[PDB]
Design a binder for this molecule. Structure first.
Ligand SMILES: Nc1ncnc2c1ncn2[C@@H]1O[C@@H]2COP(=O)(O)O[C@H]2[C@H]1O
Length: 201
DNA sequence: CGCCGCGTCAGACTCGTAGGATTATAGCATACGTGAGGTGGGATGTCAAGGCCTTTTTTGCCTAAAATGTGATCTAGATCACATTTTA
């Protein structure tokens, strides 16, 4: 199928890595759909410290809060993880798309459900567990991804101490120190950016 | 029977236009009723304060009882210039 009917009518566009997709503060007039690739959600503060909120791969909806409320502003940042490709259409078409067949917003409603529940796990994990707790649990989390690479003893993923520091919200170097604590306890290996995780599977 | 005289009876249809009448007629007195006017007066209608009950607004109050304060003792986060070191 039915998505064929949907993207048969959409306006199609490509864009490179690290381009700014959505600007925090611009008007609510366009929905977007990741056709190919992955993308990352972050936010910004008075200080300018960046805080990665989420990250999503192919098969997800982007630009969903402003669809209903006339003239909302963009409540976060979203920047390209890699060079990736998207289809887009504005809101006046989507009333034609919900009034004719409401299945699209069922799909949106499900992915938005998983979204808000992992946001509940997010705010709880941020709330109560110590630094080791939520860094460990989020490590377990991105071990899940399709982006994660296979390893005969588990998995392996490429990431810097900075960006993981931006999902837990602490300094890159203290993440270095707890990474050393987890190497001392014989649970994770790492060289530079390439971390290798045991315990999976 | 068959005139002749007299009399009776119809004379198309829808619209428009104007305002409109006239003569002369006695006079005064009696006496009675009805119309336009007063007039107190039941009686109705109004407007401002008081006694029955319930509801509402303050307001007692009743005890569970969870909350709001006391402050010295810590803790697990958080930094910054130098020394590399990794990755597209
Ligand atoms: N809690 C969140 N989780 C994931 N993405 C978010 C969140 N908040 C905002 N965004 C993203 O930021 C975008 C800002 O504009 P939209 O609300 O149209 O769509 C939003 C999402 O793509």
């Amino acid at each position: 199928p039915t998505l064929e009917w949907f993207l048969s009518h959409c306006h199609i566009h490509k864009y490179p890595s690290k381009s700014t997709l959505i600007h925090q503060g611009e008007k609510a007039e366009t929905l977007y759909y990741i056709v190919k690739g992955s993308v990352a959600v972050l936010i910004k503060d008075e200080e300018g410290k960046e805080m990665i909120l989420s990250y999503l791969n192919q098969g997800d909806f982007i630009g969903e809060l402003g669809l209903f409320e006339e003239g909302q502003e963009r409540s976060a940042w979203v920047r390209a993880k890699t060079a990736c490709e998207v289809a887009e259409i504005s809101y006046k078409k989507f009333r034609q798309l919900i009034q004719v067949n409401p299945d699209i917003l069922m799909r949106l409603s499900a992915q938005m459900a998983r979204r808000l529940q992992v946001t509940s796990e997010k705010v709880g994990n941020l709330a109560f567990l110590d630094v080791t707790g939520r860094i460990a649990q989020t490590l377990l989390n991105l071990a899940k991804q399709p982006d994660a690479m296979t390893h005969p003893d588990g998995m392996q993923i490429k990431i810097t101490r900075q960006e993981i520091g931006q999902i837990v919200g602490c300094s890159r170097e203290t993440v270095g120190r707890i990474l050393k604590m987890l190497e001392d306890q014989n649970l994770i290996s790492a060289h530079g950016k390439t971390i290798v995780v045991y315990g999976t599977r």
